[PDB]
């Protein structure tokens, strides 16, 4: 009810980010949503003395038919002061990723109940553009904590902890973790029971509300305890061709950058001479032993892997074909913190870019659950293609950072 | 007296840490001073400026300029310093409407709102920074000091504040009259509709009555401007649009500047004249920027210019947008990295045209450029019409399928259909996924000495075929490519090639059909001739037979 003073970081001005082009459907959706938000006092029209801007668009959350406004506060988030005043920061819970079920709720509507520092409001300016720029874009700023701004959960946190207290006290084994507009609620209960607890939780928020959120009813269900990883595996064959052995030596050479004791001396010796690629070469005992020793090495964890919360997470993704995608998350090269593989890319059988967008969202979700932050993606796509399309397929209320890979990596082969 | 609503003031600040201007007034002749005194007395009578006391420390210089072929002086208050110190504003006009996105109108009326401009007050707290001084006759009295009460012409904030003030006033009128459009440009309002002329005139009179609520008068004697309108380099007509006349000059010789201007005109023309090309003319501007330098036109540039003159020989117009219909975009390949397109709704009635040029870079292929063109057109279409056109593309569906399923990057093009108009975009070669049984295996390698630049490239095969060639003025990377080229040259129609060159793999795996490198082009030419090629990579220096032999031969 009283505002928390907020500032930008020293020597930084507000965001001045261009609004990208919006489709007719998204403009119409935003005009309707913002007309309502304005009537409710959440946003106010602004004049030309505010030169700031942040882009806006609209999405549909997974399994919903109602449009949701999504502001891309990435620039404002980078520019906003850090919030350690009351708490150094809320230690990320390592137990969340160990729960049988985690449900993700959109609790962002709650933020609109708290007013935003009057002196900070100008930096939240955004524009609803018109088709062909025929009419002046409709300019607004926030009067209340905005969805998607990193300051919102930080300021609302004392309120959330109090709202959730009776539920936590009644359910001490439930893990609850807030990230931006998301609430992650984890338990080890039978799913039916789990859902009932989730709905109990919604009612606390609902009860508080009437003391109606458009997307709180929804629920994105995860089962992180079953998440699957991808160790390095070598082929098991009865007939090895020269080509097969060449591929194996390549893979092992690569793996030797990750694992110390890998050897290829005896395997390389098999190919002595200048042979046809399709010629079958029997493994010698010495080569079979070296292969076996390598397989054993690859069953052990990578040495010297640790998470440092002060460093960025980096995620690489490879397109493997036939709807399959591999990925790795690391902070230091060759020190993977997680690897994975997807094939279940939903409703995108003839659309690579939709598949990649879904993959990015899934990996970001995994990252939030495991470390409580988003990775910086290295995407196997041309900038222009990605930037034209990703907003068409986006269903999350956060947005990570990304860069583009323009030269094909050889590594694709080693995760295939 | 009928009460009028005030125009809400925009609060204005200087930039952080900046104070207002304190600029010396220049001396003026007695004649100029008398002129400025008269002009300012009238502005004062009109409420535009007010005399101020001696306490205000700010100043901006004022000048008197002679209105050509006249005995009348004009004042000029030079706000350059104040402008440097004034905050940034939101500028609504940055993106201008494209004519092709406009809708046909029966009537468009122009209303002069230049007088309204002076009912927009300047923020009281900012007025002090606009102070100026008329020097006194013979410097024998204090100069007459004034500040502005209204938006000064030439001040940084005036256009944004005027426009925003007018928009705020016009909003309710527009919202409650959805059967008209209103557009402000400079000192005029343009009001368009499809109403019968009597009703359109009624709406204009209603707009005039609305504006009077703020005491804003418009001229009874109707505007001299009427369609067609010359606006932002276009001609707008009630039911079609075009660019203003494009006249390419005749010259006996061309300078850098002439050519920059020529390409500029052609670029502007290309939004409605189909098929305009600028590659060969733009190549002439490479690297050099001495505007007076004379550049001889290449034969290729002369041909391009002649082709453009033929395209421009007579007027072409676009139609406006009918939101009830789909948009269709058709693209053609023109050669040398050039692409052209048309956007239409009904056959043979383009809304607009345009072009795309290949990006600068080492290697490329036609499918990638087509994809890029599609993305450009998509984004342009979202801006102008708020939707993606259906595409008609010169690439077979099977070609596209093969491309995207096998390409290492994610890629997508939106709903499209094949149009069989050559030249068609195709895939020129396709590497094998698996080694070829019965095909000879060539182990290739190259090396160069970094000091002498001497090197060697070659191969050894499982049939005992071998070759090493000594090379001059070369590099490790070039020798690695040369070795692959030799293997392609010397092999049959099916071939397995084993390389340790990560560089060469990175290139070939990108699937180029054209390169800035002649060597890469030679490799591409060979690949096109082959029936089957499998390219295998191995790590260098790892004891791999074949590889180890050839490495020794070329590193010697
Ligand atoms: C952008 C714009 C520039 C001018 C004029 C600028 C100037 N000078 C006049 C108008 C009315 C507009 N606004 C819109 C909006 C939607 N459709 C149209 N169609 C439209 C406009 C003019 C003519 C004509 N003749 C025909 C159709 N105009
Ligand atoms: Mg070598």
mmCIF file with all atom_site columns, N, CA, C and O in Angstrom, chain A residues 16 23-24 48-49 132-134 243 253 268 271 273-275 277 319 350 352 380 382 385 405 408, chain B residues 87-88 90 95 97-98 101 103 164 375 383-384 386 404 407 409-411 441 443 534 542 545-546:
data_model
loop_
_atom_site.group_PDB
_atom_site.id
_atom_site.type_symbol
_atom_site.label_atom_id
_atom_site.label_alt_id
_atom_site.label_comp_id
_atom_site.label_asym_id
_atom_site.label_entity_id
_atom_site.label_seq_id
_atom_site.pdbx_PDB_ins_code
_atom_site.Cartn_x
_atom_site.Cartn_y
_atom_site.Cartn_z
_atom_site.occupancy
_atom_site.B_iso_or_equiv
_atom_site.pdbx_formal_charge
_atom_site.auth_seq_id
_atom_site.auth_comp_id
_atom_site.auth_asym_id
_atom_site.auth_atom_id
_atom_site.pdbx_PDB_model_num
ATOM 1   N N  . UNK A 1 16  ? 15.088 2.432   -23.969 1.00 0.00 ? 16  UNK A N  1
ATOM 2   C CA . UNK A 1 16  ? 14.587 3.049   -25.182 1.00 0.00 ? 16  UNK A CA 1
ATOM 3   C C  . UNK A 1 16  ? 14.647 2.004   -26.256 1.00 0.00 ? 16  UNK A C  1
ATOM 4   O O  . UNK A 1 16  ? 15.463 2.084   -27.172 1.00 0.00 ? 16  UNK A O  1
ATOM 5   N N  . UNK A 1 23  ? 1.182  -8.170  -35.280 1.00 0.00 ? 23  UNK A N  1
ATOM 6   C CA . UNK A 1 23  ? 0.114  -8.565  -36.159 1.00 0.00 ? 23  UNK A CA 1
ATOM 7   C C  . UNK A 1 23  ? -1.189 -7.866  -35.710 1.00 0.00 ? 23  UNK A C  1
ATOM 8   O O  . UNK A 1 23  ? -1.352 -7.483  -34.524 1.00 0.00 ? 23  UNK A O  1
ATOM 9   N N  . UNK A 1 24  ? -2.134 -7.773  -36.630 1.00 0.00 ? 24  UNK A N  1
ATOM 10  C CA . UNK A 1 24  ? -3.445 -7.247  -36.334 1.00 0.00 ? 24  UNK A CA 1
ATOM 11  C C  . UNK A 1 24  ? -4.078 -7.912  -35.110 1.00 0.00 ? 24  UNK A C  1
ATOM 12  O O  . UNK A 1 24  ? -4.643 -7.224  -34.242 1.00 0.00 ? 24  UNK A O  1
ATOM 13  N N  . UNK A 1 48  ? 4.321  13.113  -24.294 1.00 0.00 ? 48  UNK A N  1
ATOM 14  C CA . UNK A 1 48  ? 5.555  13.033  -25.085 1.00 0.00 ? 48  UNK A CA 1
ATOM 15  C C  . UNK A 1 48  ? 6.777  13.358  -24.272 1.00 0.00 ? 48  UNK A C  1
ATOM 16  O O  . UNK A 1 48  ? 7.887  13.150  -24.731 1.00 0.00 ? 48  UNK A O  1
ATOM 17  N N  . UNK A 1 49  ? 6.603  13.844  -23.055 1.00 0.00 ? 49  UNK A N  1
ATOM 18  C CA . UNK A 1 49  ? 7.757  14.082  -22.204 1.00 0.00 ? 49  UNK A CA 1
ATOM 19  C C  . UNK A 1 49  ? 8.365  12.811  -21.619 1.00 0.00 ? 49  UNK A C  1
ATOM 20  O O  . UNK A 1 49  ? 9.353  12.870  -20.889 1.00 0.00 ? 49  UNK A O  1
ATOM 21  N N  . UNK A 1 132 ? 0.491  -0.080  -39.896 1.00 0.00 ? 132 UNK A N  1
ATOM 22  C CA . UNK A 1 132 ? 1.006  0.880   -40.845 1.00 0.00 ? 132 UNK A CA 1
ATOM 23  C C  . UNK A 1 132 ? 1.233  2.272   -40.224 1.00 0.00 ? 132 UNK A C  1
ATOM 24  O O  . UNK A 1 132 ? 1.315  3.273   -40.939 1.00 0.00 ? 132 UNK A O  1
ATOM 25  N N  . UNK A 1 133 ? 1.327  2.334   -38.896 1.00 0.00 ? 133 UNK A N  1
ATOM 26  C CA . UNK A 1 133 ? 1.610  3.601   -38.225 1.00 0.00 ? 133 UNK A CA 1
ATOM 27  C C  . UNK A 1 133 ? 0.636  4.699   -38.590 1.00 0.00 ? 133 UNK A C  1
ATOM 28  O O  . UNK A 1 133 ? 0.992  5.880   -38.602 1.00 0.00 ? 133 UNK A O  1
ATOM 29  N N  . UNK A 1 134 ? -0.601 4.313   -38.909 1.00 0.00 ? 134 UNK A N  1
ATOM 30  C CA . UNK A 1 134 ? -1.590 5.256   -39.421 1.00 0.00 ? 134 UNK A CA 1
ATOM 31  C C  . UNK A 1 134 ? -2.109 6.193   -38.356 1.00 0.00 ? 134 UNK A C  1
ATOM 32  O O  . UNK A 1 134 ? -2.457 7.352   -38.632 1.00 0.00 ? 134 UNK A O  1
ATOM 33  N N  . UNK A 1 243 ? 35.175 -46.721 -41.511 1.00 0.00 ? 243 UNK A N  1
ATOM 34  C CA . UNK A 1 243 ? 34.393 -45.537 -41.205 1.00 0.00 ? 243 UNK A CA 1
ATOM 35  C C  . UNK A 1 243 ? 33.908 -45.511 -39.764 1.00 0.00 ? 243 UNK A C  1
ATOM 36  O O  . UNK A 1 243 ? 34.000 -44.504 -39.087 1.00 0.00 ? 243 UNK A O  1
ATOM 37  N N  . UNK A 1 253 ? 38.241 -38.564 -29.303 1.00 0.00 ? 253 UNK A N  1
ATOM 38  C CA . UNK A 1 253 ? 39.122 -37.416 -29.242 1.00 0.00 ? 253 UNK A CA 1
ATOM 39  C C  . UNK A 1 253 ? 38.391 -36.232 -28.613 1.00 0.00 ? 253 UNK A C  1
ATOM 40  O O  . UNK A 1 253 ? 38.954 -35.441 -27.817 1.00 0.00 ? 253 UNK A O  1
ATOM 41  N N  . UNK A 1 268 ? 43.315 -46.386 -33.160 1.00 0.00 ? 268 UNK A N  1
ATOM 42  C CA . UNK A 1 268 ? 43.877 -45.777 -34.359 1.00 0.00 ? 268 UNK A CA 1
ATOM 43  C C  . UNK A 1 268 ? 44.806 -46.760 -35.104 1.00 0.00 ? 268 UNK A C  1
ATOM 44  O O  . UNK A 1 268 ? 44.886 -46.753 -36.344 1.00 0.00 ? 268 UNK A O  1
ATOM 45  N N  . UNK A 1 271 ? 43.635 -49.119 -38.143 1.00 0.00 ? 271 UNK A N  1
ATOM 46  C CA . UNK A 1 271 ? 43.402 -48.564 -39.431 1.00 0.00 ? 271 UNK A CA 1
ATOM 47  C C  . UNK A 1 271 ? 44.726 -48.353 -40.144 1.00 0.00 ? 271 UNK A C  1
ATOM 48  O O  . UNK A 1 271 ? 44.791 -47.538 -41.060 1.00 0.00 ? 271 UNK A O  1
ATOM 49  N N  . UNK A 1 273 ? 47.688 -48.366 -42.652 1.00 0.00 ? 273 UNK A N  1
ATOM 50  C CA . UNK A 1 273 ? 47.507 -48.525 -44.077 1.00 0.00 ? 273 UNK A CA 1
ATOM 51  C C  . UNK A 1 273 ? 46.626 -47.419 -44.633 1.00 0.00 ? 273 UNK A C  1
ATOM 52  O O  . UNK A 1 273 ? 46.509 -46.358 -44.041 1.00 0.00 ? 273 UNK A O  1
ATOM 53  N N  . UNK A 1 274 ? 46.013 -47.671 -45.788 1.00 0.00 ? 274 UNK A N  1
ATOM 54  C CA . UNK A 1 274 ? 45.153 -46.716 -46.463 1.00 0.00 ? 274 UNK A CA 1
ATOM 55  C C  . UNK A 1 274 ? 43.916 -47.457 -46.991 1.00 0.00 ? 274 UNK A C  1
ATOM 56  O O  . UNK A 1 274 ? 43.865 -47.914 -48.114 1.00 0.00 ? 274 UNK A O  1
ATOM 57  N N  . UNK A 1 275 ? 42.927 -47.624 -46.141 1.00 0.00 ? 275 UNK A N  1
ATOM 58  C CA . UNK A 1 275 ? 41.868 -48.569 -46.437 1.00 0.00 ? 275 UNK A CA 1
ATOM 59  C C  . UNK A 1 275 ? 40.558 -47.951 -46.963 1.00 0.00 ? 275 UNK A C  1
ATOM 60  O O  . UNK A 1 275 ? 40.225 -46.799 -46.710 1.00 0.00 ? 275 UNK A O  1
ATOM 61  N N  . UNK A 1 277 ? 36.749 -47.099 -46.923 1.00 0.00 ? 277 UNK A N  1
ATOM 62  C CA . UNK A 1 277 ? 35.916 -46.757 -45.771 1.00 0.00 ? 277 UNK A CA 1
ATOM 63  C C  . UNK A 1 277 ? 34.951 -47.857 -45.345 1.00 0.00 ? 277 UNK A C  1
ATOM 64  O O  . UNK A 1 277 ? 34.577 -47.934 -44.163 1.00 0.00 ? 277 UNK A O  1
ATOM 65  N N  . UNK A 1 319 ? 20.034 -29.228 -33.554 1.00 0.00 ? 319 UNK A N  1
ATOM 66  C CA . UNK A 1 319 ? 18.986 -29.904 -34.341 1.00 0.00 ? 319 UNK A CA 1
ATOM 67  C C  . UNK A 1 319 ? 19.555 -31.235 -34.832 1.00 0.00 ? 319 UNK A C  1
ATOM 68  O O  . UNK A 1 319 ? 20.564 -31.259 -35.540 1.00 0.00 ? 319 UNK A O  1
ATOM 69  N N  . UNK A 1 350 ? 6.156  -29.919 -38.994 1.00 0.00 ? 350 UNK A N  1
ATOM 70  C CA . UNK A 1 350 ? 6.740  -29.391 -40.214 1.00 0.00 ? 350 UNK A CA 1
ATOM 71  C C  . UNK A 1 350 ? 7.260  -27.986 -39.952 1.00 0.00 ? 350 UNK A C  1
ATOM 72  O O  . UNK A 1 350 ? 7.386  -27.205 -40.884 1.00 0.00 ? 350 UNK A O  1
ATOM 73  N N  . UNK A 1 352 ? 10.391 -26.302 -37.876 1.00 0.00 ? 352 UNK A N  1
ATOM 74  C CA . UNK A 1 352 ? 11.625 -26.291 -37.105 1.00 0.00 ? 352 UNK A CA 1
ATOM 75  C C  . UNK A 1 352 ? 11.671 -25.206 -36.070 1.00 0.00 ? 352 UNK A C  1
ATOM 76  O O  . UNK A 1 352 ? 12.301 -25.367 -35.025 1.00 0.00 ? 352 UNK A O  1
ATOM 77  N N  . UNK A 1 380 ? 20.878 -22.529 -32.968 1.00 0.00 ? 380 UNK A N  1
ATOM 78  C CA . UNK A 1 380 ? 21.294 -22.936 -34.312 1.00 0.00 ? 380 UNK A CA 1
ATOM 79  C C  . UNK A 1 380 ? 20.295 -22.428 -35.361 1.00 0.00 ? 380 UNK A C  1
ATOM 80  O O  . UNK A 1 380 ? 19.491 -23.163 -35.916 1.00 0.00 ? 380 UNK A O  1
ATOM 81  N N  . UNK A 1 382 ? 19.594 -18.567 -37.936 1.00 0.00 ? 382 UNK A N  1
ATOM 82  C CA . UNK A 1 382 ? 19.901 -17.199 -38.318 1.00 0.00 ? 382 UNK A CA 1
ATOM 83  C C  . UNK A 1 382 ? 19.046 -16.229 -37.539 1.00 0.00 ? 382 UNK A C  1
ATOM 84  O O  . UNK A 1 382 ? 17.860 -16.418 -37.351 1.00 0.00 ? 382 UNK A O  1
ATOM 85  N N  . UNK A 1 385 ? 15.672 -15.169 -39.057 1.00 0.00 ? 385 UNK A N  1
ATOM 86  C CA . UNK A 1 385 ? 14.624 -16.163 -39.012 1.00 0.00 ? 385 UNK A CA 1
ATOM 87  C C  . UNK A 1 385 ? 14.037 -16.239 -37.606 1.00 0.00 ? 385 UNK A C  1
ATOM 88  O O  . UNK A 1 385 ? 12.816 -16.179 -37.413 1.00 0.00 ? 385 UNK A O  1
ATOM 89  N N  . UNK A 1 405 ? 24.278 -19.009 -33.688 1.00 0.00 ? 405 UNK A N  1
ATOM 90  C CA . UNK A 1 405 ? 25.389 -19.791 -34.173 1.00 0.00 ? 405 UNK A CA 1
ATOM 91  C C  . UNK A 1 405 ? 25.244 -19.886 -35.680 1.00 0.00 ? 405 UNK A C  1
ATOM 92  O O  . UNK A 1 405 ? 24.207 -20.323 -36.205 1.00 0.00 ? 405 UNK A O  1
ATOM 93  N N  . UNK A 1 408 ? 28.350 -24.342 -38.639 1.00 0.00 ? 408 UNK A N  1
ATOM 94  C CA . UNK A 1 408 ? 27.942 -25.637 -38.082 1.00 0.00 ? 408 UNK A CA 1
ATOM 95  C C  . UNK A 1 408 ? 29.001 -26.220 -37.161 1.00 0.00 ? 408 UNK A C  1
ATOM 96  O O  . UNK A 1 408 ? 30.149 -26.412 -37.549 1.00 0.00 ? 408 UNK A O  1
ATOM 97  N N  . UNK B 2 87  ? 15.422 18.027  -22.783 1.00 0.00 ? 87  UNK B N  1
ATOM 98  C CA . UNK B 2 87  ? 15.195 16.590  -22.728 1.00 0.00 ? 87  UNK B CA 1
ATOM 99  C C  . UNK B 2 87  ? 14.788 16.014  -24.076 1.00 0.00 ? 87  UNK B C  1
ATOM 100 O O  . UNK B 2 87  ? 14.298 16.697  -24.951 1.00 0.00 ? 87  UNK B O  1
ATOM 101 N N  . UNK B 2 88  ? 14.982 14.701  -24.215 1.00 0.00 ? 88  UNK B N  1
ATOM 102 C CA . UNK B 2 88  ? 14.400 13.957  -25.317 1.00 0.00 ? 88  UNK B CA 1
ATOM 103 C C  . UNK B 2 88  ? 12.901 13.739  -25.118 1.00 0.00 ? 88  UNK B C  1
ATOM 104 O O  . UNK B 2 88  ? 12.416 13.619  -23.984 1.00 0.00 ? 88  UNK B O  1
ATOM 105 N N  . UNK B 2 90  ? 9.228  11.701  -26.771 1.00 0.00 ? 90  UNK B N  1
ATOM 106 C CA . UNK B 2 90  ? 8.655  10.692  -27.653 1.00 0.00 ? 90  UNK B CA 1
ATOM 107 C C  . UNK B 2 90  ? 8.343  11.267  -29.017 1.00 0.00 ? 90  UNK B C  1
ATOM 108 O O  . UNK B 2 90  ? 7.531  12.204  -29.132 1.00 0.00 ? 90  UNK B O  1
ATOM 109 N N  . UNK B 2 95  ? 7.989  6.291   -37.601 1.00 0.00 ? 95  UNK B N  1
ATOM 110 C CA . UNK B 2 95  ? 7.581  5.365   -38.655 1.00 0.00 ? 95  UNK B CA 1
ATOM 111 C C  . UNK B 2 95  ? 6.468  5.948   -39.513 1.00 0.00 ? 95  UNK B C  1
ATOM 112 O O  . UNK B 2 95  ? 5.390  6.225   -38.994 1.00 0.00 ? 95  UNK B O  1
ATOM 113 N N  . UNK B 2 97  ? 3.475  6.006   -42.407 1.00 0.00 ? 97  UNK B N  1
ATOM 114 C CA . UNK B 2 97  ? 2.638  5.023   -43.110 1.00 0.00 ? 97  UNK B CA 1
ATOM 115 C C  . UNK B 2 97  ? 3.152  4.789   -44.503 1.00 0.00 ? 97  UNK B C  1
ATOM 116 O O  . UNK B 2 97  ? 3.557  5.750   -45.172 1.00 0.00 ? 97  UNK B O  1
ATOM 117 N N  . UNK B 2 98  ? 3.092  3.549   -44.960 1.00 0.00 ? 98  UNK B N  1
ATOM 118 C CA . UNK B 2 98  ? 3.367  3.254   -46.334 1.00 0.00 ? 98  UNK B CA 1
ATOM 119 C C  . UNK B 2 98  ? 2.059  3.384   -47.132 1.00 0.00 ? 98  UNK B C  1
ATOM 120 O O  . UNK B 2 98  ? 1.021  2.865   -46.694 1.00 0.00 ? 98  UNK B O  1
ATOM 121 N N  . UNK B 2 101 ? -0.421 0.430   -47.585 1.00 0.00 ? 101 UNK B N  1
ATOM 122 C CA . UNK B 2 101 ? -1.258 0.017   -46.459 1.00 0.00 ? 101 UNK B CA 1
ATOM 123 C C  . UNK B 2 101 ? -2.499 0.872   -46.228 1.00 0.00 ? 101 UNK B C  1
ATOM 124 O O  . UNK B 2 101 ? -3.392 0.519   -45.455 1.00 0.00 ? 101 UNK B O  1
ATOM 125 N N  . UNK B 2 103 ? -6.080 2.742   -47.170 1.00 0.00 ? 103 UNK B N  1
ATOM 126 C CA . UNK B 2 103 ? -7.330 2.293   -47.748 1.00 0.00 ? 103 UNK B CA 1
ATOM 127 C C  . UNK B 2 103 ? -7.834 3.329   -48.738 1.00 0.00 ? 103 UNK B C  1
ATOM 128 O O  . UNK B 2 103 ? -7.624 4.529   -48.543 1.00 0.00 ? 103 UNK B O  1
ATOM 129 N N  . UNK B 2 164 ? 1.110  15.807  -30.047 1.00 0.00 ? 164 UNK B N  1
ATOM 130 C CA . UNK B 2 164 ? 0.465  15.079  -28.948 1.00 0.00 ? 164 UNK B CA 1
ATOM 131 C C  . UNK B 2 164 ? -0.770 15.838  -28.444 1.00 0.00 ? 164 UNK B C  1
ATOM 132 O O  . UNK B 2 164 ? -1.811 15.233  -28.108 1.00 0.00 ? 164 UNK B O  1
ATOM 133 N N  . UNK B 2 375 ? 11.710 -13.570 -45.209 1.00 0.00 ? 375 UNK B N  1
ATOM 134 C CA . UNK B 2 375 ? 11.648 -12.943 -43.880 1.00 0.00 ? 375 UNK B CA 1
ATOM 135 C C  . UNK B 2 375 ? 11.505 -11.419 -43.957 1.00 0.00 ? 375 UNK B C  1
ATOM 136 O O  . UNK B 2 375 ? 10.744 -10.816 -43.194 1.00 0.00 ? 375 UNK B O  1
ATOM 137 N N  . UNK B 2 383 ? 4.361  -4.860  -40.687 1.00 0.00 ? 383 UNK B N  1
ATOM 138 C CA . UNK B 2 383 ? 4.329  -3.415  -40.441 1.00 0.00 ? 383 UNK B CA 1
ATOM 139 C C  . UNK B 2 383 ? 3.164  -2.744  -41.217 1.00 0.00 ? 383 UNK B C  1
ATOM 140 O O  . UNK B 2 383 ? 2.397  -1.947  -40.680 1.00 0.00 ? 383 UNK B O  1
ATOM 141 N N  . UNK B 2 384 ? 3.045  -3.044  -42.503 1.00 0.00 ? 384 UNK B N  1
ATOM 142 C CA . UNK B 2 384 ? 2.141  -2.303  -43.376 1.00 0.00 ? 384 UNK B CA 1
ATOM 143 C C  . UNK B 2 384 ? 0.697  -2.790  -43.283 1.00 0.00 ? 384 UNK B C  1
ATOM 144 O O  . UNK B 2 384 ? -0.199 -1.957  -43.320 1.00 0.00 ? 384 UNK B O  1
ATOM 145 N N  . UNK B 2 386 ? -0.261 -5.742  -41.044 1.00 0.00 ? 386 UNK B N  1
ATOM 146 C CA . UNK B 2 386 ? -0.545 -6.492  -39.846 1.00 0.00 ? 386 UNK B CA 1
ATOM 147 C C  . UNK B 2 386 ? -0.726 -7.982  -40.050 1.00 0.00 ? 386 UNK B C  1
ATOM 148 O O  . UNK B 2 386 ? -1.258 -8.689  -39.199 1.00 0.00 ? 386 UNK B O  1
ATOM 149 N N  . UNK B 2 404 ? 15.214 -28.245 -45.781 1.00 0.00 ? 404 UNK B N  1
ATOM 150 C CA . UNK B 2 404 ? 15.042 -27.913 -44.390 1.00 0.00 ? 404 UNK B CA 1
ATOM 151 C C  . UNK B 2 404 ? 15.213 -29.137 -43.511 1.00 0.00 ? 404 UNK B C  1
ATOM 152 O O  . UNK B 2 404 ? 15.767 -29.058 -42.408 1.00 0.00 ? 404 UNK B O  1
ATOM 153 N N  . UNK B 2 407 ? 19.163 -29.585 -43.326 1.00 0.00 ? 407 UNK B N  1
ATOM 154 C CA . UNK B 2 407 ? 20.030 -28.450 -42.941 1.00 0.00 ? 407 UNK B CA 1
ATOM 155 C C  . UNK B 2 407 ? 20.248 -28.408 -41.452 1.00 0.00 ? 407 UNK B C  1
ATOM 156 O O  . UNK B 2 407 ? 19.361 -28.703 -40.673 1.00 0.00 ? 407 UNK B O  1
ATOM 157 N N  . UNK B 2 409 ? 20.732 -25.973 -39.370 1.00 0.00 ? 409 UNK B N  1
ATOM 158 C CA . UNK B 2 409 ? 19.980 -24.990 -38.622 1.00 0.00 ? 409 UNK B CA 1
ATOM 159 C C  . UNK B 2 409 ? 18.481 -25.198 -38.721 1.00 0.00 ? 409 UNK B C  1
ATOM 160 O O  . UNK B 2 409 ? 17.960 -25.713 -39.725 1.00 0.00 ? 409 UNK B O  1
ATOM 161 N N  . UNK B 2 410 ? 17.767 -24.744 -37.712 1.00 0.00 ? 410 UNK B N  1
ATOM 162 C CA . UNK B 2 410 ? 16.338 -24.545 -37.802 1.00 0.00 ? 410 UNK B CA 1
ATOM 163 C C  . UNK B 2 410 ? 16.024 -23.511 -38.886 1.00 0.00 ? 410 UNK B C  1
ATOM 164 O O  . UNK B 2 410 ? 16.692 -22.474 -38.964 1.00 0.00 ? 410 UNK B O  1
ATOM 165 N N  . UNK B 2 411 ? 15.009 -23.776 -39.714 1.00 0.00 ? 411 UNK B N  1
ATOM 166 C CA . UNK B 2 411 ? 14.601 -22.830 -40.689 1.00 0.00 ? 411 UNK B CA 1
ATOM 167 C C  . UNK B 2 411 ? 13.116 -23.052 -41.024 1.00 0.00 ? 411 UNK B C  1
ATOM 168 O O  . UNK B 2 411 ? 12.604 -24.137 -40.798 1.00 0.00 ? 411 UNK B O  1
ATOM 169 N N  . UNK B 2 441 ? 38.282 -44.446 -51.979 1.00 0.00 ? 441 UNK B N  1
ATOM 170 C CA . UNK B 2 441 ? 38.458 -43.630 -50.783 1.00 0.00 ? 441 UNK B CA 1
ATOM 171 C C  . UNK B 2 441 ? 39.756 -42.824 -50.938 1.00 0.00 ? 441 UNK B C  1
ATOM 172 O O  . UNK B 2 441 ? 40.831 -43.384 -50.979 1.00 0.00 ? 441 UNK B O  1
ATOM 173 N N  . UNK B 2 443 ? 42.129 -40.058 -49.119 1.00 0.00 ? 443 UNK B N  1
ATOM 174 C CA . UNK B 2 443 ? 42.592 -39.396 -47.892 1.00 0.00 ? 443 UNK B CA 1
ATOM 175 C C  . UNK B 2 443 ? 43.335 -38.159 -48.323 1.00 0.00 ? 443 UNK B C  1
ATOM 176 O O  . UNK B 2 443 ? 44.342 -38.324 -49.022 1.00 0.00 ? 443 UNK B O  1
ATOM 177 N N  . UNK B 2 534 ? 30.732 -38.759 -50.322 1.00 0.00 ? 534 UNK B N  1
ATOM 178 C CA . UNK B 2 534 ? 30.697 -38.858 -48.876 1.00 0.00 ? 534 UNK B CA 1
ATOM 179 C C  . UNK B 2 534 ? 31.955 -38.190 -48.346 1.00 0.00 ? 534 UNK B C  1
ATOM 180 O O  . UNK B 2 534 ? 33.063 -38.578 -48.741 1.00 0.00 ? 534 UNK B O  1
ATOM 181 N N  . UNK B 2 542 ? 46.519 -38.404 -35.187 1.00 0.00 ? 542 UNK B N  1
ATOM 182 C CA . UNK B 2 542 ? 46.004 -39.399 -34.252 1.00 0.00 ? 542 UNK B CA 1
ATOM 183 C C  . UNK B 2 542 ? 46.264 -40.834 -34.639 1.00 0.00 ? 542 UNK B C  1
ATOM 184 O O  . UNK B 2 542 ? 45.694 -41.761 -34.028 1.00 0.00 ? 542 UNK B O  1
ATOM 185 N N  . UNK B 2 545 ? 45.285 -44.292 -40.342 1.00 0.00 ? 545 UNK B N  1
ATOM 186 C CA . UNK B 2 545 ? 45.971 -44.610 -41.570 1.00 0.00 ? 545 UNK B CA 1
ATOM 187 C C  . UNK B 2 545 ? 45.379 -43.804 -42.697 1.00 0.00 ? 545 UNK B C  1
ATOM 188 O O  . UNK B 2 545 ? 44.258 -43.385 -42.642 1.00 0.00 ? 545 UNK B O  1
ATOM 189 N N  . UNK B 2 546 ? 46.109 -43.630 -43.768 1.00 0.00 ? 546 UNK B N  1
ATOM 190 C CA . UNK B 2 546 ? 45.565 -42.862 -44.860 1.00 0.00 ? 546 UNK B CA 1
ATOM 191 C C  . UNK B 2 546 ? 45.814 -41.411 -44.574 1.00 0.00 ? 546 UNK B C  1
ATOM 192 O O  . UNK B 2 546 ? 46.634 -40.782 -45.243 1.00 0.00 ? 546 UNK B O  1
#
